[PDB]
């Protein structure tokens, strides 16, 4: 029962998943990072994002 709050990254996924499955029945946790994963979407969606041109910014 364990809240984490930081930013997220790749890795902290990565690990994350780990630390879950590392103590949780494979499927039980393999199924996790899927609903919230597909929620990656729908958010990211909502924030939405994309290039510009000068997206290609040049310092």
């Amino acid at each position: 029962m364990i809240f984490r709050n930081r930013v997220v990254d790749k890795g902290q996924l990565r690990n994350l998943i780990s630390w879950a499955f590392t103590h949780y029945g494979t499927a039980r946790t393999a199924v996790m990072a899927d609903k919230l994963k597909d929620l990656g979407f729908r958010y990211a969606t909502r924030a939405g994002v994309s290039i510009s041109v000068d997206d290609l910014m040049v310092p």
Partner: protein, 124 residues
């Protein structure tokens, strides 16, 4: 000598009946053998007998168009795939015809994006 049904003679109607590529080895080989003996008897000069014995030992080609005489020629001067050229390369029967048979019952369709479904299960 291998059985016939398996080197078989093939069927395309029209007269283009492909046959095979080792029965012709034979074709050689039997003739070089019989015609020869069929010298023996008449016991004519070895110039046509002892010289054929090489055209007889030449059966080596049957066993390999390719080690050690120049190979014999095929429809396209190919190394007429020797009987010892059927299960030899990765594409030569052998493993690919056993370790890697093709096989039946299954699907082969383009895998386009389709993330809607879950993971533990695929979408047929």
């Amino acid at each position: 000598v291998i059985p016939p049904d398996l080197r078989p003679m093939v069927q395309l109607d029209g007269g283009r009946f492909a046959t095979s590529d080792l029965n012709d080895l034979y074709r050689r080989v039997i003739n070089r053998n019989n015609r020869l003996a069929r010298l023996q008897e008449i016991l004519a000069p070895e110039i046509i007998v002892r010289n054929e014995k090489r055209m007889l030992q030449e059966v080596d080609a049957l066993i390999d168009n390719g080690r050690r005489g120049r190979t014999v020629v095929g429809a396209n001067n190919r190394p007429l795939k020797s009987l010892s050229d059927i299960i030899e390369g990765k594409q030569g029967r052998f493993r690919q015809n056993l370790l890697g048979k093709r096989v039946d019952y299954s699907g082969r369709s383009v895998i386009v994006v389709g993330p809607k479904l879950k993971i533990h299960q695929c979408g047929l």
